[PDB]
Design a protein around this ligand. Sequence first.
Ligand SMILES: O=C1c2c(nnn2Cc2ccc3ncccc3c2)CCN1c1ccccc1
Length: 286
Amino acid sequence: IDLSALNPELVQAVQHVVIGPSSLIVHFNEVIGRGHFGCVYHGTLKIHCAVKSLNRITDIGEVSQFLTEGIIMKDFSHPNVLSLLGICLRGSPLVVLPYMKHGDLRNFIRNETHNPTVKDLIGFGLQVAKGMKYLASKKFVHRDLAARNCMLDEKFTVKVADFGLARDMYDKEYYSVHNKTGAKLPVKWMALESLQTQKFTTKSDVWSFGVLLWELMTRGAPPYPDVNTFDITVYLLQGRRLLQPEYCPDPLYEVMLKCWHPKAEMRPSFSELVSRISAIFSTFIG
Ligand SMILES: O=C1c2c(nnn2Cc2ccc3ncccc3c2)CCN1c1ccccc1
């Protein structure tokens, strides 16, 4: 670790993010997750954790920047946002994250084992809105909000994941290669202006959130299955939105349409979404 290379402000914060090799046993025997950048394994820190390797990439880039990203992410603390436990050095560094017993939100709602009520699903969405409210107040744009990118712990607490050092493509099926810029993009979750410009804002996160609400209410159906990749722009511009799911409350569909407002600055803040969804949520029993 090259301490002088860092922003002098961040030097103190390093000891709080770095995990000593002797504090962490990672069980490389079974893969429990797969990303484009690397595999993840059970880890023991006595705390049970998910340890993500990054050795599938050629290079992590600047080590000082890697550390910086880690420091920024560690200071984030909210019950609906996945935390960073730390970084452990060994080849490539290991990302140490909490173990999420019930996996990703999309698979959770698709799972025939669990039977979430409409109230449960709305509540999952509310927790996401709250996670996103915190992230937006930190001026952080997620860029890849989707049900696949949120996770549930042992107490079914929903946490926005897939950001900072945990960022990766964990389900490659839903990402498309752009023509002019070789980037791999979650087009079916993206706002119109993002599809056109490839710029992401909190307001395009709000668009993605609307889609995530639709995923929740369809128990994990794929959005726009009869649309092909980048022809989604054509489809939307025909004057189309995802349809109201069978058990989606009318006011909740209205929230979704608001999230998909053609004017980015007219979409609701995440604070307004927390408010509106909490109200809809309170009307249900069971
Ligand atoms: O794998 C992930 C993921 C995310 N952010 N960090 N990660 C890595 C991660 C974090 C905690 C875990 N806990 C238990 C098992 C695997 C884990 C992976 C986003 C969602 N996700 C995932 C998992 C399964 C399928 C699709 C996406």
